[model samples]
Target: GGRFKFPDGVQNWPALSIVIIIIMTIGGNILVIMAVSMEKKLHNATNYFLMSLAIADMLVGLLVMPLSLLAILYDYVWPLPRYLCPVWISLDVLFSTASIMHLCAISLDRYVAIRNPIEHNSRTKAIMKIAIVWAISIGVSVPIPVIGLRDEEKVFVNNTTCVLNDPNFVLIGSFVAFFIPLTIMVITYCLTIYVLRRQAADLEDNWETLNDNLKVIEKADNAAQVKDALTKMRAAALDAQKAMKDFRHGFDILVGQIDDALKLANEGKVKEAQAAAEQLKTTRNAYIQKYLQAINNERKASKVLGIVFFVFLIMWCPFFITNILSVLCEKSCNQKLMEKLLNVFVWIGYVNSGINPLVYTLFNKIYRRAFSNYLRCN
Candidate 1:
């Protein structure tokens, strides 16, 4: 495979644009990792899933994007060793697929939390949910080596662009990795949204009906019933207080010894700084295993999770569709036009990873405050 020129009219915009993308992708995911790790309030079960997702997306930025940019720069040529090409492809499948699988697991967790708030608050259940999420993601993506090796020569040619040459592989791989997970995500989020809205409506109706009954009871000469209602109201108020306490507890995962150590470190104690950093890592890992419960609920961050998932789909679906279409119907489309289109959509897809930090944390006040304090921008 000798060097082939790009189609007559297509410039190198994709190659040029990838520099900004690489920065965005790497920078955004790094922020997520820092925000989640350093911020005590952001510690919880839902963010554990988010943290994992951020790591995977960060891997995409670190492991996948630079080589991809080079390939585009060289007009889609592999431009690297043949053996390494398949390895890159395998990781590409692994992390990209893992990202989607995380979304599915997250959607499931949010649905359960909204539909059954009590169970959602359990520490054991939260750990189990995250474990299952990683398990499924690994199960789905860990076979990329086998898939790539089974038909490597055709797709991994030296000096040529890496792509799936077999239509069977294209159809099967895309269906299994992209389409199925996307469908499941769509269904789960739809169900989650419906249940959430219905629950909200029911609460409003109950409040209105209770108000009417309260007026009647007050007007009636039934002193016994009025007294019973007042007792129940007091009990309900206590329950609400307990629930708020639980919410506060969910955010207070840190022991703060690290904070003390960091204070010492800031006073120019290098040894203490090293010790504190290790302690922070240990404590962070302990919290991840011990608890990952809800940070917010009821039309809050969980709903924002759904919106982010929707954005992921919108950004990446076109690239996948165009990829499969090009592979399956290579002869029908004009090579130049399709090439340009693929570059456009591919950049669009990569940009999704870059935006994940913003999508997950922009509306989150805790994250915003943590970010500002750490970076110390005026």
Candidate 2:
């Protein structure tokens, strides 16, 4: 072969973006995998989703982002033998969708666990949840390039605009890649918030009950015995609270997952159902790790949610809104700033891959000890 050089020639702006994306995405995703793998306690339901998130982000960092960024840096034209362009872009859409849906799926799970506490943990039901998430994600994702079209050129040129030669593909790609997924994600998070808010009222009951019990136990028996009993009682209460919290946390998964599982069950996919059940089992374990204080679980879900939902509001929202507005206004307006901001959200979402570890290890001592114990064992 003659030579393989960047088509658009390497430029600083795109190079800088790629460099940042590479560092943050790789570091964040790897830290997540290492953290969860090392911290045995993290090997539960919520973290499982987080693990999926890490995998997705890893895909972005190692595969999709670099290629896309390289393509952008080389201008809109890719230098990597024109044959690879469609293949690379297709993978980009697929993996990015996976990342988006996983976030949505986790959010929905949080909503369900919070909203339908009693039902969130059933093995059969949870299986269905997992089934739906993977089904919809893998199912819907496989067809992107199938529906759209692509063409390769013998030679290509790179330019700074970072767009296709045919403007029509922009519309098609946006619909398939950004618009559809963003819409789904928006719906999922909104539904999650709705469900979460609805379930918020019950959280205080556990706190009040624990407080009442604490007052009663203080005055009886020898001080040591009383302390011991209270400790045991508190532990019991915590266990119960943990269970409730599991419900709250797991419910979110349920919301995102249940319909898919139920659909599978109806279709008689026993193996799929079993997998979903396993996912739920893992999810439940994660929830137990979270512990009760239904309110506390609610708090955790809310906090984690800020990462996904807030990113969308700040990042993706602008891209489409302006796109729609530009169409209506019938003027050529640039969303270059918004697109750049969206990349920042991408940065935030990538970091989100491992965020729960901080939440778990830093705030939840039990979870931290369990994690440390897991580390010692391995």
Candidate 3:
């Protein structure tokens, strides 16, 4: 009877699932935003970007998805008043564009952080970059309502469904808003991994060089040679210890042990010096093992980030591909079928917003703790 008809029977299933997705998207991103805001440990540039991204996703849930669910229930037709259609489309484009832009900015930021640590450490610069991302997203999407509201043909398909009808805008907007950012994100992510792996390899080289210096101290023949070797070994050990500063709890004790061994050798106690040197070797080996474990953990953390990037690609690619294809193959393709595919693909993209928080919970202990604390009302 009314313009907006309710779904009956199994058709309600899709609506039910979409409602679940909307709730999760809002709830999950709220947790992410709260985690970043409340947790002092998360007050870094990367986490700040993530919180902004969560803001975009949360808005998608709040402002976009429920209207989309209404359209689906109305059999993919625009059930709202005609003027509101363009406003809804503008919002849809705004949030999704912002989402991808945030990802692109984050990948670029991380690459800069890895390559030039000092420059990327500026909070002011990070804020400026995030602002630019939002500005660009607004630039791309704001035009939608400007052109769309003035002429209904640009947004309404056959005066029934609400979808972009301007092929030029669709084509240009897809490239500028999605594909270009995707290319930059993938390229920078790969470069970040390359630089990180190289740094880890350099850490191994430092340890190896220090190990060789220790062996030289043990094998020194004369008193003068022993003194010279001790001085050189101390310099090398200090360099290695400085590199592993975060994990250097017992480092001073180990250095003092080395000093005691050197003193024994100077007092003409040959067997005692040899035994002290043997004990030092055991202690040094244990420290090296601990450092190696830390390196391995760092590598594993990078792998988790790689997974996040991969998931983002997998979730969004199909929607953008289908989006462009619909524009390019307008005459050759069936419009109804393309519309159906796009509807499904777009929700897949929306699911990515919720997925990121889940991935963080699964892989990161800090995020897990923050999320649990928030959930427990702590």
Candidate 4:
């Protein structure tokens, strides 16, 4: 019916959006970098680190974007004069890995600052922090493409630019990228959030300071309207409590129904028990759909973020799936289009490098200050 038949309404929107993103992101971020760099007031550790982040994002926009555009135009072909396929892919891997690793660094910085404010200010050196970020990110990224590799494959659908492009490579790379880094990010952030929660509960600070700090973390564009965002977090917190209560009530009802069914069956009221069990199944089915639909997008986003480094898992899924169906797929595969699409997601994931800062920096006061000042003065 349609060509590439790009899932209805796909109209190169993503690619065009990427281009628009290039302008907005690169242009906006560059202005930010200049402001932070020139202004001495914005020279604190948080802002210093944020400028670094802007550079990272800017690179994605400037350095990476052009090549990606060229790659896409070339029909996903790599006909560069030099044998740069390896180096090209590696650059993409390095920037992305470094960006996320820096995210981990930023979270650690937050935990330290929130958990022990006095020490975070005095004991933590900006130089040491910068060094640690570079050391860790560089250390983590160096080995990825060097060890795990990929190639193209032909699938029945538009060809898949699968990763590991090889199976044994798939197993090992998946372990490193998806499982390992995800474990690190999740555990680090979870512990940070837990520590922050406990500290928040135990602290004796005045409500004003508490509210102020939260406003900083959560972000409010207007000092005049600052309380609104904080109010929302508070409201969200309360709603979550209510949701938990409802869940518990529902769970009790479900367990009670199951117990009643079991009891009736044991007492030889089999027909009644069967009817109850059937009703329970129907209700559970509806509830399951309700539950999944409620959180499906959140769940999807969580999985995408959690599987950060292991994106090749998605990239290479089809190639391996084909092996399982090899009896039917008796054809040798070529990866012309498959590789192209895989690169797109790979790049999309790289854009996430820019996103992490949007999370950490957007909330931190320094980010807001730098951004605002950048717009106003710089």
Candidate 5:
């Protein structure tokens, strides 16, 4: 007969905290995924990337964090079968690599879409890029299990703790998988912001030109100039009306389609309900392309991106910095202190996985609405 036993005293606190993190990470990310899939407004290439990132984050919560908590409970010792250690390490590396790679790809994709919208806006293209990201991540991570499973020394530290033992792989893998992508993400993000600011200035110039044209119509005595100003103003007004009409039509379709999907969902036709929701996304996309490409929307998106980037940097930098420092100062530094720091820093990095959905809820109205509706079971 076997009985379950709870951790004691200080161990109980860390265990409770980790359990809370796991719950939040999994629950929040699932909400994000559901919002993206079910909400008509969230269908876009950038959002698709976000949904994929959420999947990685959710998996980290589901598969990686529990084992980590177990290791912590056992005081940093391997508690699982010897063969499972490498699999666990590979998963840890794979998800973290995938998360950063997805962000890097998002930065590049947004830059290209903004810099040249005519070519880079295809959903198929985004899917291909996402596939490439996962492929590269797997390529970086797959070798670990191969190397670890073949030799016991590569994984087990003194046949107790399970951690990667190859310093060469650690240094090089960190550079290739984390540092390089991080650098590219930061550079692309900067360029994207610069471009967006320039676009905003250009929009202001257009507004000024419109105002000058109105002034010309107001004060000009010359019939020819007055007629020219009137013609331009009428054309601009008509163009704006056309855009408004297109947006309204799309919105009406979205509302109707959503209602129908809800009806189907209530009837328990789950697959058909999802299909209905999926079908309406193209209509939403058409309007987004035709009318929603405004300066305000871009600015909002930029704000969200800024927050996400800052949080990611704050969460992951401590771990990666300490990881490299510990390796570099192997001979000179205090080994026990370095190990303690690494353990804490790694959990901090894990916490990053769960923070993004909260970021979206705080910053984005659509996500907030969707989250509330889902939570209220509507």
Candidate 6:
């Protein structure tokens, strides 16, 4: 009956809630897209993943939400003729799965960046990563609409629902689209944190070793610098030419250690090299420490990317859990409770789309300044 329509209790609020989400999603992602495109400061390798993520979210807002609004408007009904229903399902699955897969890709991107900054910053490598993200996003979503031979029940039937009706498909698709990607993101970030912590500890240890030994050498007599020390040794060795040769050979060895330490320092292992050079300086010679500046600065990667992934996990996990449960235990779960649970969980996922801008842009000083200036300009 036509009377079996939107619940009396659900009146304009669901539609209104979706509208707010739509505005937040489209407007926020567009801001990110524009900032990344126009701001010179935002033009770095990692921002490429950020920009792609925004595009994926934008599709959710611009393409998926508007169509989905009709479903909300008509009490979760298909709200369109049978012929156009698969189109709705396809776009819905494609963009949403893309968004989730993009999260997975972005997590890996940041992991590599923190793990090996030099290699991740390469333009060619960054581009390859971006290409692979889109390819996987497209690949993951294609199965939903392409592999199916559908009747009314295969998709959603008609005026009372717009969900995929095939239980097995939902089970498999939910696992692929949500569970696998989410697991990867979490594990990658776990390792990324571990690696960062270890580097920080090593740096501190190196600083302590250098500090305890180098202060005595810091009070060096200027005349007893490299040339002066060598001169004294020469005078002492003048009586025995073999002693002179041995003294010269030892000088060469000290110089070689300093050179090797400096070389290792250049490749970003400042602590190990700093300790070596400073230890040599403590041995009554100028070594390299007196000739060069101290290594006080430490290497650290930005935490912006981890913050983004963390937010993604928090927002989407519930949705995936409920989704997987519904499909896997089709007969046992209460239909009414499942529908209500979906109403809550699906919107939670939508809320995630809106929150990406905050996670991706606002927390970062560089993007924050760029966006503030970009917003003021236009």
Strongest candidate by TM-score: 3
For candidate 3, the per-residue lDDT at 284 reads: 75
Residues 1-378 of candidate 2: C-alpha lDDT, one tens digit per residue: 765565435654635554764665665566667766777666666666666667776776777666666655654445665546556655655665566666666666766666666742544554565556556655544443443343332123352223334444445545665577677777777787777765564444543443443444333434343334334433434444344434654545543443454345445544454344445445445654344554566777777676657755565455545544433444465557545655455444444433534443565565556556655766
Which RMSD values do the candidates have, in order?
Answer: 16.4, 16.2, 3.8, 20.1, 14.5, 10.7
Per residue, candidate 1 scores C-alpha lDDT tens digits across 70-161 of 67666676666677877787677777777777767777776787677785255566577667766765665555566666767556645467
Clashes of 1: 3
Q: Which residue pairs in candidate 3 collide? A: none
Clashes of each: 3, 25, 0, 8, 0, 0
**All candidates: TM-score:** 0.69, 0.56, 0.83, 0.51, 0.74, 0.71
Instruction: Point out the higher-scoring one by TM-score: 5 or 6.
Output: 5
Task: Give the range of the ten consecutive residues with the poorest summed lDDT in model 2.
Answer: 153-162
lDDT of 1 at 299: 59
- Candidate that beats the other on lDDT, 5 or 6, i.e. the better one: 5
lDDT assessment of candidate 1: 0.64
For 266-362, candidate 3 gives per-residue lDDT tens digits of 8766556656767767877777777878689669958976987899899999999899999899798898998888889989988887786787678
* lDDT for 194 (candidate 2): 70
TM-score of model 6 vs. true structure = 0.71
Best-to-worst ranking by TM-score: 3, 5, 6, 1, 2, 4
Q: Write the per-residue lDDT of candidate 4 for residues 1-378, one digit (tens) a residue.
A: 532422243334445445655566576567667657776776777767766766666776667666665555444543342234445555655555555555556556655664566762532576676667666556555554554333323111123222223344435434554456556656766665566445443321322332353434234334223333323334333333233345435444655664555455455444565455455555444445444443453344334344532443343344334433333333565455544444555555655645544544444466577667766874
What is the C-alpha local distance difference test score of each model? Answer: 0.64, 0.54, 0.79, 0.50, 0.75, 0.65
Candidate 6 lDDT over 1-378, as tens digits, reads 454443343444647565866887898888888878987877887787788889888988887777777667766655456667677677777778777877787777667766786762466776887687777767766765664443556666544565777777777777888888878987988888787776566544533443443443233433223223323333332222221234445445555654564455455443565455465655424422321222221222435555676688778888778888877776888878987988777777877877888676765787788778777987
Total clashes in model 3, counting residue pairs 3 or more apart in sequence or in different chains: 0
Residue 34, model 3: Cα distance from true site in angstroms? 2.7
Residue 158 CA error for candidate 1 (Å)?
7.4
